Write a structure and sequence with these properties.
The complex is a heterodimer of chains A (about 625) and B (about 575). Chain A is α/β, with parallel strands linked by helices and about 625 residues long. Chain A contains 24 helices and 12 strands. The chains are: A alpha/beta (about 625), B alpha/beta (about 575). Bound molecules: adenosine-5'-triphosphate (ATP), adenosine-5'-diphosphate, vanadate ion and magnesium ion (2 copies).
């Protein structure tokens, strides 16, 4: 299904590339960890000096250590002598505070050095994390610009947006909150294990016994919690899909009386998401207490056995103090990792989704050749295309467009008129055949240059969040004010813009604004006109615009229609009258073609379509 | 600025305050148990080791074992109840946001947009829930550990607890200074994250327009600059965050060295025992490690604050369209439209878009509304649906004001195909069920046949179960129009509102659909917004609006002789 271990490996490899700066980060971390781990041994030596002085002060000065042990054995209870045997005290001396002070000064210097090294390592980690995050966002943007249209068509917009924006932010947050902890914990475990091996093998065995038991309990808990996490993400996706469908079509949901059904569906999906989230959170959070419990069991065992050994004289009190410090500093990294396991798990899931998006197949290898329309002649040669292979939509289609000719495309509602100009713009790849502009194949040229050469009025009008001026200048952002104003006036955008109190400054949007459907279409027309295209495609450009306004629009656009090989798709036959070439296509095939006079004389489909106005 | 965050927390954690109290009690018990284990170790050193009493060592080890069992029990209880409280808070906040958004009108919903509403119904709520969860789990440990460690130090050796009483405020002050310098950087980083997300959303929503105009280099440059700015802010935040661990550890270590020095000074005299050094070292290593743990996840606070600002912005929006006190409920509303002296002005506009509009649509008749682009036909259609409320006058459907009705029966009597429509993701049958929700396959096929949509649905191998994309973009524009028409038809409503529902149909398909609707909607009132004069001849009444007011009312023959605007339209459309 989904690869989380591989995604975690890929994320780690992106965060820690070849040994240029990651080597410096690792070395600084190792040095700081080792220097700060040495410290408890020094503190234990100071404690040993204090204990030795305090114990030896109370014994008579005339006796040696062996004589003191013998005297203690001659006394009662036997065990004080065994305790004294390992002390290495000098009776009647007391505490030498000079040695204590020197030892503590050494410890303080080492601690300062360790703090400085840790600070530098943290700064380098921040730099490298931000580098990988910038690279990740840039790669996501490039992938968005490289994907085929069927990828966006087959998915919901909100799901893709969350995979593109939310998942990257989640990766950033998880990495910035866990990477330094991870590195420090991994280094600290081995450094502390080394020092505990130095102090005493038996107690370090007792301490390292935790790792098998902790890993086993972690495996059990993670086996019980991974299905819960999968269910939580599935339910979250279902809830987000329902919310997106309800919000996007809120007018249809609201007006058609389906508001209560949407509310009930949301309630059930919200309850499912809550139950799955609670289960996943509880089981994921169970990891830290279990690790702490096993570490505390080992701590109790170490404390008891160490106290027994010190009372017997096998280990000194300062050594046991250092070992207790090391047991705490060994258990802390495991507990920290267990506590941040949930953040790591969320980040790894987000990385899995992002890498899934980044591994999607792209359109094709875009040719580096720049498009150059010398005259504007467009020709189709047996072009066949089909979405969802097995259902042909265009087959064995051919046409010739003269460099100045206005080609009109008319026909039934699902004939393939939009598909034809989408193939011309190379929005989709032709299954069989080829399309040539001025003798050069459009499949052997860069998509960017080809699409910039052709100025298209989309059938589905779209505007971005911004001013009317910005939307019109979207066609050619480098144009000056006079050109934008002229393009708006020619498309009669200026006529309704002057009415508004914020002419050219009023903000419009795809789903709203101070605009109407006809005015939105007019703005799209002006946007396409400002691009001064060499090839013009108007795919139902006046469907939402009244005939009185469209006549003036045609009068103004006669300048552009003269020498730019206009492709006109229109269900209003008056708008495509007197066109140089009229194509009538019915089921993806051009069943009849010619000018208005020849098509009328030939009768056929075009004559029937024109006679619909006259009735019968 | 975090005023809205606290209001949201206070409102939506109130049902779980008892769970929070239980979590706090269990957390303090577990933290004091973990702090008490070093105290028992100190007792082992002082009582057992210093006196050679191994039996006392074994007894205190048993005490330590019991303390560890209590600690693990309390930690498990704390994580369970914290998960319960956090997930309940998130569930309740999501429900509240969704319920408030579903009461919005068109204007209030458009003030935010569907994408923004979805994001702040899911991810903003998730961010605030994560804040609650991490506060319950890890953030409260640091104050509890600090206070409990101070009290444990007082219990162990009151003559050396001043070292903790000095070390804790010093680290607190240093961390407070770092946080004061770091929080505005985090807020700026969140602002830039919102900006880059807006750029990405704009790019994804208009990907077809981007590729049509070859705007790839411009979008790439815009994203590169936004990415660089966000990276600079994140680098500054990381610069400030990289000081928190070294300062905390330096305080730990300086406090440990001073502890050894001053404890040795006190142990040289008969004022302190050796095991208190072990106890205090563990107290430092626990208190400031808890502080270090709590300080690492501090990015979640400004993010939660801005997300709460957005959520409270949505939740503070007041709806303008409601059932007033007690809606009138006519039996089987199936009649006429009044529209008496209706005047409408869009909110935030300087001039009204409709002025003194007065015309009556008789029941069972077809009324055609004609006009220029931006005349106000869609506004009038939305006023009939009561998607917007008239500034002045009234609409008076069935002789009763649309404001006096509850908007469920008014919408059940109206089958609307809007100018800007929507087809949901799923199947054709599922989309058609929005019209009826209990329709059989036979009446589904009848509705498809009326809309001339039966051919391309039957042609699919899956028939009525042919998949439909999120907006129907796997269909042609006229196929989407015919699906919307079929959805309106399957409802069999009393009133048909065709807000330019035939602009994407060819002449033959338009004629077939219009004849089928004439056969079907003969008994139902029809209000049609059309541009072709040839199709308004069949209409019983034609309304012409220009500049936002009615310029002529009558039939086609009457209007071509008395209405200059209608005459101009007919002359323009003449063949
Ligand atoms: N939020 C808004 N939504 C729609 N129209 C608005 C809004 N704010 C102001 N208007 C104004 O409302 C007027 C009428 O808009 P409406 O959509 O009703 O026009 P129409 O004539 O029905 O449409 P079309 O352009 O398709 O013929 C426009 O001139 C527009 O400037
Ligand atoms: N992006 C798409 N994915 C799948 N099918 C599509 C897509 N775009 C168009 N079609 C299908 O192509 C068929 C005919 O092509 P189209 O250009 O839509 O016809 P026309 O321009 O005559 O309306 C329609 O039945 C439509 O459903
Ligand atoms: O369904 V259409 O012929 O308006 O592309
Ligand atoms: Mg089309
Ligand atoms: Mg309209």
């Amino acid at each position: 299904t989904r690869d989380f271990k591989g995604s975690a490996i890929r994320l780690a490899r992106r965060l820690l590339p070849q040994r240029a700066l990651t080597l410096a980060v690792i070395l600084l971390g190792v040095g700081g960890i080792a220097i700060g781990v040495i410290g408890p041994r020094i503190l234990g030596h100071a404690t040993d000096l204090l204990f030795n002085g305090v114990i030896g002060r109370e014994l008579p000065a005339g006796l040696t250590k062996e004589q003191a042990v013998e005297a203690a054995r001659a006394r009662g209870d036997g065990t004080f002598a065994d305790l004294l045997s390992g002390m290495d005290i000098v009776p009647g001396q007391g505490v030498d505070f000079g040695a204590v002070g020197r030892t503590l000064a050494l410890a303080l210097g080492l601690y300062l050095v360790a703090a400085l090294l840790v600070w530098v390592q943290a700064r380098l980690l921040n730099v490298t994390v931000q580098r990988t995050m910038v690279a990740l966002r840039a790669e996501v943007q490039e992938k968005i610009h490289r994907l085929p249209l069927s990828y966006f068509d087959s998915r919901q917009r909100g799901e893709v947006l969350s995979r593109v924006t939310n998942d990257v932010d989640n990766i950033q947050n998880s990495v910035s909150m866990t990477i330094s902890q991870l590195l420090t914990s991994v280094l600290t475990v081995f450094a502390v294990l080394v020092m505990m091996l130095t102090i005493s093998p038996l107690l370090t065995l007792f301490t390292v016994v935790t790792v098998p038991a902790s890993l086993w309990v972690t495996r059990w808990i993670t086996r019980r919690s991974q299905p819960l996490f999968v269910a939580q993400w599935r339910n979250t996706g279902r809830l987000a899909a329902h919310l997106e469908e309800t919000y996007s079509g809120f007018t249809i949901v609201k007006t058609f009386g389906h508001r209560e059904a949407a509310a009930g569906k949301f309630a059930e999906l919200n309850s499912e998401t809550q139950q799955s989230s609670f289960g996943a959170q509880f089981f994921s959070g169970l990891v830290s207490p279990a690790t702490m419990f096993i570490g505390n069991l080992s701590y109790v065992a170490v404390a008891v056995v160490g106290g027994l050994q010190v009372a017997t004289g096998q280990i000194t009190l300062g050594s046991i103090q250092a070992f207790i410090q090391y047991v705490r500093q060994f258990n802390q990294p495991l507990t920290q990792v267990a506590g941040m396991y949930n953040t790591l798990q969320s980040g790894i899931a987000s990385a899995e989704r992002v890498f899934d998006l980044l591994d999607t197949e792209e359109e094709s290898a875009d040719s580096p050749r720049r498009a150059d329309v010398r005259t504007g002649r467009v020709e189709f040669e047996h072009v066949s295309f089909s979405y969802v292979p097995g259902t042909p939509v265009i087959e064995d289609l051919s046409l010739v467009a003269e460099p100045g000719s206005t080609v009109a495309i008319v026909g039934p509602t699902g004939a393939g008129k939009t598909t034809l100009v989408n193939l011309l713009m190379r929005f989709y790849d032709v299954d069989s055949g080829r399309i040539t502009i001025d003798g050069v194949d459009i499949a052997s040229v860069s998509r960017e240059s080809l699409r910039a050469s052709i100025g298209m009025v989309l059938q589905d009008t779209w505007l971005f969040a911004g001013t009317i001026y910005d939307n019109i200048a979207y066609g050619r952002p480098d144009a000056d004010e006079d050109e934008v104003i002229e393009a708006a006036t020619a498309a009669y955008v200026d006529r309704f813009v002057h009415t508004l109190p914020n002419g050219y400054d009023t903000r419009v949007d795809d789903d709203g604004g101070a605009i109407s459907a006809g005015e939105k279409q007019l703005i799209t027309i002006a946007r396409a006109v400002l691009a001064r295209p060499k090839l013009l495609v108007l795919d139902e450009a006046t469907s939402s615009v009244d005939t009185r306004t469209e006549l003036l629009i045609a009068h103004a656009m006669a300048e552009l229609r003269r020498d730019r090989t206009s492709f006109i798709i229109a269900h209003r036959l008056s708008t495509i009258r007197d066109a140089d070439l009229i194509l009538v296509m019915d089921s993806g095939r051009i069943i009849e073609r010619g000018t208005h006079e020849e098509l009328l004389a030939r009768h056929g489909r075009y004559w029937e379509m024109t006679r619909v106005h006259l009735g019968g | 600025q975090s005023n809205m965050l606290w209001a949201l927390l206070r409102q939506y954690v109130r049902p779980y305050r008892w769970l929070l109290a239980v979590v706090a009690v269990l957390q303090v018990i577990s933290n004091m148990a973990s702090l008490y284990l070093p105290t028992v170790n100190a007792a082992i050193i002082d009582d057992g080791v210093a006196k050679g009493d191994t039996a006392r060592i074994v007894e205190l080890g048993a005490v330590m074992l019991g303390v560890t069992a209590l600690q693990v029990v309390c930690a498990v209880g704390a994580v369970f109840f914290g998960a319960r409280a956090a997930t309940g808070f998130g569930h309740d906040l999501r429900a509240a946001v969704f319920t408030h958004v579903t009461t919005f009108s068109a204007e209030e919903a458009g003030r935010f947009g569907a994408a923004s509403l979805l994001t702040r119904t899911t991810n903003d709520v998730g961010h605030i829930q994560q804040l609650v969860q991490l506060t319950v789990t890890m953030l409260i440990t640091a104050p509890i550990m600090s206070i409990g460690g101070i009290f444990m130090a007082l219990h162990q050796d009151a003559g050396l607890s001043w070292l903790l009483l000095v070390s804790v405020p010093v680290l607190g002050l240093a961390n407070y200074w770092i946080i004061r310098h770091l929080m505005p950087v985090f807020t700026r980083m969140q602002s830039l994250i919102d900006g880059i997300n807006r750029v990405l959303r704009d790019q994804l929503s208009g990907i077809r327009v981007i590729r049509a105009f070859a705007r790839e280099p411009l979008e790439r440059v815009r994203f590169a600059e936004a990415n660089q700015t966000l990276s600079d802010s994140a680098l500054e935040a990381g610069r400030w965050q990289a000081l928190m661990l070294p300062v905390t550890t330096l305080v730990i270590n300086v406090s440990s060295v001073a502890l050894i020095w001053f404890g040795g000074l006190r142990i040289d005299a008969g004022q302190m025992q050796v095991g208190s050094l072990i106890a205090f070292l563990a107290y430092f290593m626990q208190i400031l490690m808890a502080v270090l743990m709590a300080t690492f996840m501090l990015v979640i606070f400004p993010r939660a604050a801005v997300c709460a600002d957005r959520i409270g912005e949505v939740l503070s929006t007041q709806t303008a369209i409601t059932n007033p006190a007690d809606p009138v409920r006519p039996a089987a509303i199936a009649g006429d439209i009044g529209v008496h002296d209706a005047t409408f002005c869009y909110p935030g506009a300087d001039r009204p878009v409709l002025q003194d509009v007065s015309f009556t649509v008789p029941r069972g008749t077809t009324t055609a509304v004609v006009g220029s682009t931006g005349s106000g036909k869609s506004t009038l259609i939305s006023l009939i649906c009561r998607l917007y409320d008239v500034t002045s006058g009234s609409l008076r459907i069935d002789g009763v004001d649309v404001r006096d009705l509850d908007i469920e029966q008014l919408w059940s009597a109206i089958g609307l195909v809007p100018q800007r429509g929507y087809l949901f993701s799923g199947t054709v049958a599922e989309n058609l069920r929005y019209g009826r929700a209990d329709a059989t396959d036979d009446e589904m096929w009848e509705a498809l046949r009326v809309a001339a949509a039966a051919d391309f649905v039957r042609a699919h191998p899956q028939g009525l179960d042919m998949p439909v994309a999120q907006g129907g973009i796997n269909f042609s524009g006229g196929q989407r129009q015919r699906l919307a028409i079929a959805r309106a038809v399957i409802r069999r409503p009393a009133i048909y509102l065709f807000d330019d529902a035939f602009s994407a149909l060819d002449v033959h398909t338009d004629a077939r659909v219009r004849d089928a609707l004439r056969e079907v909607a003969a008994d139902a009132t029809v209000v049609i917004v059309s541009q072709r004069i040839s199709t308004v001849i069949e209409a019983d009444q034609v309304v012409v609006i220009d500049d936002g007011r009615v310029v002529g009312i009558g039939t086609h023959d009457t209007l071509l002789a008395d209405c200059p605007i209608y005459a101009e339209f007919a002359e323009s459309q003449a063949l």
